[PDB]
Fold:
Amino acid sequence: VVFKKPLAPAP
Amino acid sequence: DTRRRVKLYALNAERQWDDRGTGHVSSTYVERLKGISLLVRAESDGSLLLESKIQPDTAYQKQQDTLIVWSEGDNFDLALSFQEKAGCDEIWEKICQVQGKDPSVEITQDI
Structure:
């Protein structure tokens, strides 16, 4: 809730 | 301080984002790296969790207003997860200044 987790890595 | 409070995530071999710790992010010139670099100081013990040069051609991607995500090398993906959008914006602006981008971009390179 405090820190979002990434969805995918960058391209 | 909380504006620069972050969690560092790193993508592992199993393609899970591993939580590498909470800390505070800044930028500064690092001589041994010959350029402006992102530094994350750990809340745990004050060590540098991250010391990452902002290369001119790295594709940094801003996700969900509070994530800055990039490839730090071959098979090496990192993400800074910001507690506050305002802090994310500050670091994003610095990345954009180093690379020469309009800070309204959501990715600093094409493709």
Q: What stands out?
A: Chain A touches chain B at residues 2-7, 9-11 (CB under 8 Å). Chain A is about 0% helix and 0% strand.
